Amino acid sequence: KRGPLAKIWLAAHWDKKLTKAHVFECNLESSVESIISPKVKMALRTSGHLLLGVVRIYHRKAKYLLADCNEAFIKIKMAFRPG
Amino acid sequence: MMDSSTFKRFTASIENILDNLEDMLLLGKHQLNELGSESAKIKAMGIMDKLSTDKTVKVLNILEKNIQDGSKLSERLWRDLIMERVTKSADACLTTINIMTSPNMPKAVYIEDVIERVIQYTKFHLQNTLYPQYDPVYRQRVIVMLYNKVCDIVSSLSELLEIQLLTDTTILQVSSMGITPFFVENVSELQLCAIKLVTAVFSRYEKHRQLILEEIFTSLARLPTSKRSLRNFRLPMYIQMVTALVLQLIQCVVHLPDVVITNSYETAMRTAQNFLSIFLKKCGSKQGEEDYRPLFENFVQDLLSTVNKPEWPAAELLLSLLGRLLVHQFSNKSTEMALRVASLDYLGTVAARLRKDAVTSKMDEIQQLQKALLDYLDENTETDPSLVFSRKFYIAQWFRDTTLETEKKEIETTGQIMHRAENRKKFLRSDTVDYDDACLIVRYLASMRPFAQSFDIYLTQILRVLGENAIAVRTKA
Amino acid sequence: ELKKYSHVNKKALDQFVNFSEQKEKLIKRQEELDRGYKSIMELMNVLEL
Amino acid sequence: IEERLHTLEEEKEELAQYQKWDKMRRALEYTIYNQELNETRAKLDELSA
Amino acid sequence: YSAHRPVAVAAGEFLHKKLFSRHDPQAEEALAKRRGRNSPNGNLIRMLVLFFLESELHEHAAYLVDSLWESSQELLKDWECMTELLLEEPVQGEEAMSDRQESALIELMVCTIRQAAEAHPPVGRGTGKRVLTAKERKTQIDDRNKLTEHFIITLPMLLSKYSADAEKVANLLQIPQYFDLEIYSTGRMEKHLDALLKQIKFVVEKHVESDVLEACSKTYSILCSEEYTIQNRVDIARSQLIDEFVDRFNHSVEDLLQEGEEADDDDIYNVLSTLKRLTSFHNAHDLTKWDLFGNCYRLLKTGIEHGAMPEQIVVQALQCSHYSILWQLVKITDGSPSKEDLLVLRKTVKSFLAVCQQCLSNVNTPVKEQAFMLLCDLLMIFSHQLMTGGREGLQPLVFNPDTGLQSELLSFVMDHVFI
């Protein structure tokens, strides 16, 4: 809805409205984990949900990077032989 | 005019004062701008009877000019920047005009280095400048005039490449640019010029068919997919661009000089069937994160939307090959689910609107009709170029029609021999008919060929798939 | 000389220059993912404690 | 990818050699055809005389 | 023909209701709009033509068409119908299309298509508070498309039928101001453009009228739109025709300036016609690459010395020299001012000033007025506001007025204005 952590709320709870644009470059994972580490008033279950969000988005980056490597595999194999 | 040496000496004075003041390092904008402006038509007949080594030294000089902004890698310095590209673009215009200028062009008044240089200039500066601000996905009159110069230079590049053979180390990247702008928005006239370029490279060389189809299938996902200005090719009835690109690849290869006609024409259907087979097999399965289906539906409605116009043939051949592929695939059980349901859906669409076209269309005589239509399209080629390829495709089509008539008596042998003689006479030969009459006579010719008379047969194929072992497919059938 | 120079695929300069750049863009991102992996492994150990 | 890139690097030097040979062959071909047109002109005038 | 537009529009709606019942019975369709043929609507066009003939209260049907605009929207876009009823002799068996009727129909077409392009009513009927809705603009655009594709076809044999008719050519060449030129790039009809260029070249070389030359020059300037791809293709024909006219002008002038025999009326007519064409096409187009100020200035100086030769030649020479001077003035504010050609241009302007002062002292009164207005142009060129637009190197060009010239101007104004 609103906030830097709103995308993580969508990932933890909705997960359907997420698109590839947010997945690729919207935030740095290592940044946001150190954002969430020292926060005050942090309830246990909401921390668990933020862990859901970060785990989900990290694994989605791994799947999309695997994908990227796949079309890399297609583009490297081409060659031109006039014979 | 046999000489018209009344501004021939004007231009000749221009280059001799230029190479005097430069040879004994830039020549500035205005002089070269007017030089290209007069080079448009004044030397287009008068370039002959000019000193050859002076041509070599001036193309070397303007080569050294275009070296400067060749891969240039680029509030007040921007004025220098824009004037640099406009100056070198005018220089590019002079190169691409000067080389093509004579109808007969003597060998080695050129070196491929300068054509390579204008090519790489085109590559870098086009991809740097014109795509990002005419397509925000990749992201005042100077841009517009630069655009028009790009259009003119690539058109002249196309006809120059048709004039003479070039090396493959040019062919690969000129084909790359000929296909490049077909996935951005506001480039329609550039796309016509790119059609001209791909006619030149495709009909001129038979060794890059595989190449062209592979770069076609690579970046199909980059299509705009926008409701605004998707169909912008007049024939109302505007059509999408890459469909007409495919069509002119289909009709572009003839290789008109005996059995050369037959083998080249079956080569044409083979190249087409490889194209559509690979395109279909890439489309049929659902790939990750994207799809090629909507490409296939819009492509095929455009294909049958341009089914029967006398200057767009072979769409009937596409539809016959479509019927053959669909009966080959969906009858089995081994093929994947999405391909079968796709082919059944396109079969339903073509059958329905073909049926309504059939019920809404109709409601030496053959030689007379053939000669009248060929005269009318000869007029059209005298008016509109590049349709000579369609004419030669038609000649091959009638040759193979008489062939399939021959193998399916002696009076029919005499008749087909007379038709063969007429065809060869019109080969050696290589009124007041209208476009509407041309459409009527070409749909009459299509009615003569056993093509539209198989519709119920296709329904029969549906009858062969009425009983199935899988429910979903026959439900939506 | 050129009869023996016939069987080799072309455009290798374009291929190598392009694909080295794509290699480097995959290199830095794959270097990133492992650093995030140890980061989340450490943070899991923290959350457990 | 790394080994495929290295293979295309040797083939990149190979293509450099191939294209050098190709241009010098074309230059020689054009030179001998200049020679054949010059001899042609010569022969023409000789036969006319 | 009321000045008030609502009254006129109500009257025109009444007229459309009354006098249009050839095949429309003011009832249902299948016989009312068109009978599927290219014939029923001909008679509606016919009493439009007859109404314009009898309406002698106007030489132009502008107010009549504006009144009949919204009431007969479907009828006024059917341009193909009166196109066959103007050129290719329809199968209705009617009489020959009368020349007065031809001019009347052409004037009606001028009015209808100009109202089709621009929707604003003419002066007196003007409002200025006009807003365009989406429906209005889409109707305007596809109207432009259909008129473009129709009339690129019809204008070649239109001119071929009416090449010698000066006023009909002048009327017909106002429509190309409203043609979207990129449709030519999409329609691939630049060949018909070039055919019409050769046809209007034949008209230009066959006609000597100043008005038709003005219309042709304006048409060329409209189609000299550099923002469209066709600019090279049209510039081919423009350069060809002006080069022909340069050669003809030099050939005629180098024999006219010498006394010889005689100079007779034929050489005078050739010089006057060629200089008329050159001046007309030099007004709208930069043609200073063909420096004919030598010939024009020699003609002006021999007009000064002799004084016994026709008025119109001197008028055309003065205007053409002024056009050359102002077109040179165009390519000095382009950010690249030199100094040698700057002083050369100032000297030529000073010679032109002397010629204009002599022509103001010349006894001919239209020559006096033309010299006065040319001097006005020269002084506003070298005015104090020349320094407004961030200029530095134009200071040598600035020329101060002469007190005797000022007194001559005041005397001319008092003798020829305040009467």
PDB file of all heavy atoms in Angstrom, chain D residues 20-37:
ATOM      1  N   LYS D  20      42.280 -11.197 -43.121  1.00  0.00           N
ATOM      2  CA  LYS D  20      43.464 -10.607 -43.745  1.00  0.00           C
ATOM      3  C   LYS D  20      43.770 -11.284 -45.078  1.00  0.00           C
ATOM      4  O   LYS D  20      43.974 -10.612 -46.105  1.00  0.00           O
ATOM      5  CB  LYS D  20      44.657 -10.707 -42.793  1.00  0.00           C
ATOM      6  CG  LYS D  20      45.968 -10.163 -43.350  1.00  0.00           C
ATOM      7  CD  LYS D  20      46.947 -11.286 -43.671  1.00  0.00           C
ATOM      8  CE  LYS D  20      48.336 -10.743 -43.964  1.00  0.00           C
ATOM      9  NZ  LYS D  20      49.295 -11.831 -44.301  1.00  0.00           N
ATOM     10  N   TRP D  21      43.778 -12.625 -45.075  1.00  0.00           N
ATOM     11  CA  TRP D  21      43.993 -13.384 -46.306  1.00  0.00           C
ATOM     12  C   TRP D  21      42.912 -13.082 -47.338  1.00  0.00           C
ATOM     13  O   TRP D  21      43.198 -12.984 -48.538  1.00  0.00           O
ATOM     14  CB  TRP D  21      44.032 -14.881 -45.990  1.00  0.00           C
ATOM     15  CG  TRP D  21      45.377 -15.386 -45.537  1.00  0.00           C
ATOM     16  CD1 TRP D  21      45.745 -15.704 -44.262  1.00  0.00           C
ATOM     17  CD2 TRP D  21      46.511 -15.677 -46.365  1.00  0.00           C
ATOM     18  NE1 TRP D  21      47.044 -16.147 -44.240  1.00  0.00           N
ATOM     19  CE2 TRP D  21      47.537 -16.144 -45.518  1.00  0.00           C
ATOM     20  CE3 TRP D  21      46.762 -15.581 -47.736  1.00  0.00           C
ATOM     21  CZ2 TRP D  21      48.793 -16.509 -45.999  1.00  0.00           C
ATOM     22  CZ3 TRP D  21      48.010 -15.943 -48.211  1.00  0.00           C
ATOM     23  CH2 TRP D  21      49.009 -16.403 -47.345  1.00  0.00           C
ATOM     24  N   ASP D  22      41.672 -12.886 -46.879  1.00  0.00           N
ATOM     25  CA  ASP D  22      40.559 -12.641 -47.792  1.00  0.00           C
ATOM     26  C   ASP D  22      40.706 -11.302 -48.508  1.00  0.00           C
ATOM     27  O   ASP D  22      40.582 -11.235 -49.740  1.00  0.00           O
ATOM     28  CB  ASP D  22      39.237 -12.710 -47.026  1.00  0.00           C
ATOM     29  CG  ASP D  22      38.031 -12.540 -47.929  1.00  0.00           C
ATOM     30  OD1 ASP D  22      37.534 -13.557 -48.459  1.00  0.00           O
ATOM     31  OD2 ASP D  22      37.574 -11.394 -48.104  1.00  0.00           O
ATOM     32  N   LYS D  23      40.984 -10.223 -47.759  1.00  0.00           N
ATOM     33  CA  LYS D  23      41.183  -8.931 -48.421  1.00  0.00           C
ATOM     34  C   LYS D  23      42.394  -8.934 -49.346  1.00  0.00           C
ATOM     35  O   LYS D  23      42.330  -8.358 -50.441  1.00  0.00           O
ATOM     36  CB  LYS D  23      41.294  -7.751 -47.445  1.00  0.00           C
ATOM     37  CG  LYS D  23      39.968  -7.108 -47.021  1.00  0.00           C
ATOM     38  CD  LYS D  23      39.108  -7.781 -45.990  1.00  0.00           C
ATOM     39  CE  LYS D  23      39.761  -7.641 -44.634  1.00  0.00           C
ATOM     40  NZ  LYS D  23      38.906  -8.209 -43.573  1.00  0.00           N
ATOM     41  N   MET D  24      43.513  -9.548 -48.935  1.00  0.00           N
ATOM     42  CA  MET D  24      44.666  -9.511 -49.838  1.00  0.00           C
ATOM     43  C   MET D  24      44.416 -10.345 -51.098  1.00  0.00           C
ATOM     44  O   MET D  24      44.885  -9.978 -52.187  1.00  0.00           O
ATOM     45  CB  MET D  24      45.953  -9.896 -49.086  1.00  0.00           C
ATOM     46  CG  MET D  24      46.090 -11.279 -48.453  1.00  0.00           C
ATOM     47  SD  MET D  24      46.225 -12.668 -49.584  1.00  0.00           S
ATOM     48  CE  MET D  24      47.725 -12.173 -50.432  1.00  0.00           C
ATOM     49  N   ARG D  25      43.636 -11.432 -50.980  1.00  0.00           N
ATOM     50  CA  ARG D  25      43.238 -12.193 -52.162  1.00  0.00           C
ATOM     51  C   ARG D  25      42.372 -11.355 -53.094  1.00  0.00           C
ATOM     52  O   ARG D  25      42.543 -11.405 -54.319  1.00  0.00           O
ATOM     53  CB  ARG D  25      42.481 -13.459 -51.762  1.00  0.00           C
ATOM     54  CG  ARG D  25      42.114 -14.335 -52.957  1.00  0.00           C
ATOM     55  CD  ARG D  25      40.667 -14.809 -52.922  1.00  0.00           C
ATOM     56  NE  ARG D  25      39.722 -13.739 -53.221  1.00  0.00           N
ATOM     57  CZ  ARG D  25      38.416 -13.919 -53.371  1.00  0.00           C
ATOM     58  NH1 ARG D  25      37.861 -15.110 -53.223  1.00  0.00           N
ATOM     59  NH2 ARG D  25      37.648 -12.877 -53.672  1.00  0.00           N
ATOM     60  N   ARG D  26      41.415 -10.603 -52.536  1.00  0.00           N
ATOM     61  CA  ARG D  26      40.554  -9.777 -53.383  1.00  0.00           C
ATOM     62  C   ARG D  26      41.356  -8.682 -54.078  1.00  0.00           C
ATOM     63  O   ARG D  26      41.087  -8.351 -55.242  1.00  0.00           O
ATOM     64  CB  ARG D  26      39.405  -9.168 -52.580  1.00  0.00           C
ATOM     65  CG  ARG D  26      38.508 -10.176 -51.898  1.00  0.00           C
ATOM     66  CD  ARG D  26      37.152  -9.577 -51.592  1.00  0.00           C
ATOM     67  NE  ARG D  26      37.254  -8.288 -50.918  1.00  0.00           N
ATOM     68  CZ  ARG D  26      37.401  -8.128 -49.611  1.00  0.00           C
ATOM     69  NH1 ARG D  26      37.574  -9.160 -48.802  1.00  0.00           N
ATOM     70  NH2 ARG D  26      37.394  -6.899 -49.105  1.00  0.00           N
ATOM     71  N   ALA D  27      42.330  -8.099 -53.369  1.00  0.00           N
ATOM     72  CA  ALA D  27      43.212  -7.105 -53.978  1.00  0.00           C
ATOM     73  C   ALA D  27      43.991  -7.702 -55.144  1.00  0.00           C
ATOM     74  O   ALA D  27      44.100  -7.081 -56.210  1.00  0.00           O
ATOM     75  CB  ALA D  27      44.173  -6.538 -52.935  1.00  0.00           C
ATOM     76  N   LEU D  28      44.533  -8.910 -54.957  1.00  0.00           N
ATOM     77  CA  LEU D  28      45.257  -9.584 -56.036  1.00  0.00           C
ATOM     78  C   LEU D  28      44.343  -9.879 -57.221  1.00  0.00           C
ATOM     79  O   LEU D  28      44.758  -9.755 -58.382  1.00  0.00           O
ATOM     80  CB  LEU D  28      45.893 -10.870 -55.517  1.00  0.00           C
ATOM     81  CG  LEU D  28      47.154 -10.693 -54.673  1.00  0.00           C
ATOM     82  CD1 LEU D  28      47.628 -12.036 -54.168  1.00  0.00           C
ATOM     83  CD2 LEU D  28      48.246 -10.009 -55.477  1.00  0.00           C
ATOM     84  N   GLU D  29      43.106 -10.301 -56.943  1.00  0.00           N
ATOM     85  CA  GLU D  29      42.146 -10.603 -58.002  1.00  0.00           C
ATOM     86  C   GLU D  29      41.831  -9.359 -58.823  1.00  0.00           C
ATOM     87  O   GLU D  29      41.814  -9.396 -60.064  1.00  0.00           O
ATOM     88  CB  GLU D  29      40.867 -11.173 -57.386  1.00  0.00           C
ATOM     89  CG  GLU D  29      39.756 -11.444 -58.381  1.00  0.00           C
ATOM     90  CD  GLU D  29      40.055 -12.631 -59.271  1.00  0.00           C
ATOM     91  OE1 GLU D  29      40.696 -12.446 -60.324  1.00  0.00           O
ATOM     92  OE2 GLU D  29      39.639 -13.753 -58.918  1.00  0.00           O
ATOM     93  N   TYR D  30      41.581  -8.239 -58.139  1.00  0.00           N
ATOM     94  CA  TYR D  30      41.335  -6.984 -58.841  1.00  0.00           C
ATOM     95  C   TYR D  30      42.555  -6.549 -59.643  1.00  0.00           C
ATOM     96  O   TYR D  30      42.417  -6.035 -60.759  1.00  0.00           O
ATOM     97  CB  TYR D  30      40.906  -5.898 -57.856  1.00  0.00           C
ATOM     98  CG  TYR D  30      40.701  -4.562 -58.524  1.00  0.00           C
ATOM     99  CD1 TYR D  30      39.641  -4.357 -59.395  1.00  0.00           C
ATOM    100  CD2 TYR D  30      41.556  -3.499 -58.266  1.00  0.00           C
ATOM    101  CE1 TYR D  30      39.451  -3.138 -60.013  1.00  0.00           C
ATOM    102  CE2 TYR D  30      41.365  -2.270 -58.867  1.00  0.00           C
ATOM    103  CZ  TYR D  30      40.321  -2.102 -59.751  1.00  0.00           C
ATOM    104  OH  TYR D  30      40.128  -0.883 -60.358  1.00  0.00           O
ATOM    105  N   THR D  31      43.758  -6.766 -59.099  1.00  0.00           N
ATOM    106  CA  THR D  31      44.981  -6.389 -59.804  1.00  0.00           C
ATOM    107  C   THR D  31      45.153  -7.186 -61.095  1.00  0.00           C
ATOM    108  O   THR D  31      45.460  -6.620 -62.154  1.00  0.00           O
ATOM    109  CB  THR D  31      46.189  -6.588 -58.886  1.00  0.00           C
ATOM    110  OG1 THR D  31      46.042  -5.775 -57.714  1.00  0.00           O
ATOM    111  CG2 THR D  31      47.478  -6.213 -59.603  1.00  0.00           C
ATOM    112  N   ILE D  32      44.944  -8.505 -61.031  1.00  0.00           N
ATOM    113  CA  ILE D  32      45.121  -9.312 -62.236  1.00  0.00           C
ATOM    114  C   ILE D  32      44.017  -9.021 -63.244  1.00  0.00           C
ATOM    115  O   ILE D  32      44.235  -9.132 -64.455  1.00  0.00           O
ATOM    116  CB  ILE D  32      45.219 -10.821 -61.924  1.00  0.00           C
ATOM    117  CG1 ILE D  32      43.898 -11.388 -61.402  1.00  0.00           C
ATOM    118  CG2 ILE D  32      46.347 -11.093 -60.951  1.00  0.00           C
ATOM    119  CD1 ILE D  32      43.850 -12.897 -61.381  1.00  0.00           C
ATOM    120  N   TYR D  33      42.825  -8.626 -62.787  1.00  0.00           N
ATOM    121  CA  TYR D  33      41.806  -8.257 -63.763  1.00  0.00           C
ATOM    122  C   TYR D  33      42.055  -6.877 -64.373  1.00  0.00           C
ATOM    123  O   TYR D  33      41.688  -6.645 -65.533  1.00  0.00           O
ATOM    124  CB  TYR D  33      40.422  -8.366 -63.129  1.00  0.00           C
ATOM    125  CG  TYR D  33      39.793  -9.719 -63.395  1.00  0.00           C
ATOM    126  CD1 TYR D  33      40.477 -10.892 -63.102  1.00  0.00           C
ATOM    127  CD2 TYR D  33      38.526  -9.822 -63.944  1.00  0.00           C
ATOM    128  CE1 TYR D  33      39.911 -12.130 -63.351  1.00  0.00           C
ATOM    129  CE2 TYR D  33      37.947 -11.055 -64.191  1.00  0.00           C
ATOM    130  CZ  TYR D  33      38.645 -12.205 -63.893  1.00  0.00           C
ATOM    131  OH  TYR D  33      38.078 -13.433 -64.140  1.00  0.00           O
ATOM    132  N   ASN D  34      42.703  -5.966 -63.637  1.00  0.00           N
ATOM    133  CA  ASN D  34      43.229  -4.758 -64.271  1.00  0.00           C
ATOM    134  C   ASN D  34      44.246  -5.111 -65.344  1.00  0.00           C
ATOM    135  O   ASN D  34      44.257  -4.514 -66.429  1.00  0.00           O
ATOM    136  CB  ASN D  34      43.891  -3.836 -63.250  1.00  0.00           C
ATOM    137  CG  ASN D  34      42.931  -3.311 -62.225  1.00  0.00           C
ATOM    138  OD1 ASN D  34      41.858  -2.834 -62.575  1.00  0.00           O
ATOM    139  ND2 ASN D  34      43.305  -3.388 -60.952  1.00  0.00           N
ATOM    140  N   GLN D  35      45.121  -6.072 -65.043  1.00  0.00           N
ATOM    141  CA  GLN D  35      46.103  -6.512 -66.026  1.00  0.00           C
ATOM    142  C   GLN D  35      45.426  -7.120 -67.249  1.00  0.00           C
ATOM    143  O   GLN D  35      45.865  -6.896 -68.387  1.00  0.00           O
ATOM    144  CB  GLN D  35      47.070  -7.504 -65.384  1.00  0.00           C
ATOM    145  CG  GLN D  35      48.297  -6.844 -64.779  1.00  0.00           C
ATOM    146  CD  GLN D  35      48.921  -5.820 -65.707  1.00  0.00           C
ATOM    147  OE1 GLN D  35      49.353  -6.147 -66.813  1.00  0.00           O
ATOM    148  NE2 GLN D  35      48.972  -4.571 -65.260  1.00  0.00           N
ATOM    149  N   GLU D  36      44.341  -7.876 -67.040  1.00  0.00           N
ATOM    150  CA  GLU D  36      43.677  -8.497 -68.181  1.00  0.00           C
ATOM    151  C   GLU D  36      42.924  -7.464 -69.015  1.00  0.00           C
ATOM    152  O   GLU D  36      42.880  -7.586 -70.244  1.00  0.00           O
ATOM    153  CB  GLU D  36      42.752  -9.641 -67.740  1.00  0.00           C
ATOM    154  CG  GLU D  36      41.336  -9.264 -67.338  1.00  0.00           C
ATOM    155  CD  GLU D  36      40.439 -10.472 -67.154  1.00  0.00           C
ATOM    156  OE1 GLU D  36      40.957 -11.608 -67.161  1.00  0.00           O
ATOM    157  OE2 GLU D  36      39.212 -10.285 -67.027  1.00  0.00           O
ATOM    158  N   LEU D  37      42.403  -6.399 -68.397  1.00  0.00           N
ATOM    159  CA  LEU D  37      41.758  -5.377 -69.217  1.00  0.00           C
ATOM    160  C   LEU D  37      42.790  -4.543 -69.969  1.00  0.00           C
ATOM    161  O   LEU D  37      42.538  -4.132 -71.109  1.00  0.00           O
ATOM    162  CB  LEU D  37      40.823  -4.495 -68.380  1.00  0.00           C
ATOM    163  CG  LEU D  37      41.255  -3.634 -67.192  1.00  0.00           C
ATOM    164  CD1 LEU D  37      41.697  -2.237 -67.614  1.00  0.00           C
ATOM    165  CD2 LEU D  37      40.137  -3.556 -66.167  1.00  0.00           C
TER     166      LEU D  37
END
